[PDB]
Amino acid sequence: KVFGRCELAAAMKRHGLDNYRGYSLGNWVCAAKFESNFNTQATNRNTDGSTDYGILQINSRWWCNDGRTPGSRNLCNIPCSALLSSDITASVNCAKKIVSDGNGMNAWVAWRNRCKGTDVQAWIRGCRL
Ligand SMILES: Nc1cccc(O)c1
Ligand SMILES: Nc1cccc(O)c1
Ligand SMILES: [Cl-]
Ligand SMILES: [Cl-]
Ligand SMILES: [Cl-]
Ligand SMILES: [Cl-]
Ligand SMILES: [Cl-]
Ligand code: NA
Ligand code: NA
């Protein structure tokens, strides 16, 4: 599914991301935009052989099982394919674990490089929430 901006903001709010661990909604929308272009089916192989999955590009080295990342863990205890659904529940639930792991949203390199320090509220302007 390719979400619209506001459509995603609303879905993320319904799933509890707004101000989760202190991160306002626009942080999550901005991160999704630059991670996946708002596409739940995005997959991208990393240099270490892991793959990133879904709207928040969650990585198989640590977070999910894809059966092809030797020596990895599955800390969200989910198949990586769950993270590609049109329903964002699994991605949101795993993102909550990731952002609680000690480095906050810095776990998403794109957030750190593209959203942190910027006016992220822009990403939810205009939306019915
Ligand atoms: N050593 C190790 C670490 C994680 C996963 C596995 O299958 C092996
Ligand atoms: N100093 C500064 C300004 C905006 C956001 C942030 O994370 C830090
Ligand atoms: Cl957009
Ligand atoms: Cl694996
Ligand atoms: Cl959804
Ligand atoms: Cl934090
Ligand atoms: Cl915001
Ligand atoms: Na804020
Ligand atoms: Na894994």
The distance of Cα 20 from the centroid of its chain, to the nearest Å, equals: 13
Neighbouring-strand partners of residue 53: 43, 58
Could you tell me if 72 and 50 are in contact, meaning their C-beta atoms sit under 8 angstroms apart? yes
Domain boundaries, the chain: 1-129
Task: For 63-93, give one letter per residue: b (16+ CB within 10 A) or e.
Answer: bbbbeebeebeeebebbbebbbeeebebbbb
Distances in Å between the Cα of 45 and the Cα atoms of 60, 61, 66, 128 are: 10, 11, 12, 35
CATH number of 1-129: 1.10.530.10
Q: What is the resolution of this structure in A?
A: 1.4
Query: How far away, in angstroms, is 103 Cα from ligand 6 center?
Result: 6
Instruction: Name the amino acid, one letter, at 122.
Output: A
Tokens of 75: 């800390």
**Is 71's C-beta closer than 6 angstroms to any atom of ligand 1?**
yes
For residues 1 and 89, the answer to whether their CB atoms sit within 8 Å is no
Residues whose beta carbons lie less than 5 angstroms from ion ligand 6: 104
Instruction: Label the pairing between strands 51-53 and 58-59.
Output: antiparallel
CA–centroid distance, residue 81 to ligand 8 (Å): 32
Q: Rounded to the nearest 5°, which phi and psi values hold at 58? A: -80, 135
* Closest by CA position to 13, among listed 80, 5, 59: 5
Determination technique for this entry = X-ray
Ligand 2 pocket, residues with Cβ under 6 angstroms: 116-117
Nearest CA to ligand 2 atom 4: 117
Alpha carbon of 118 to those of 80, 84, 85, 87, 107: distances in Å?
A: 30, 28, 29, 28, 17
Q: State how far the Cα of 22 lies from the Cα of 123, in Å rounded to an integer.
A: 17
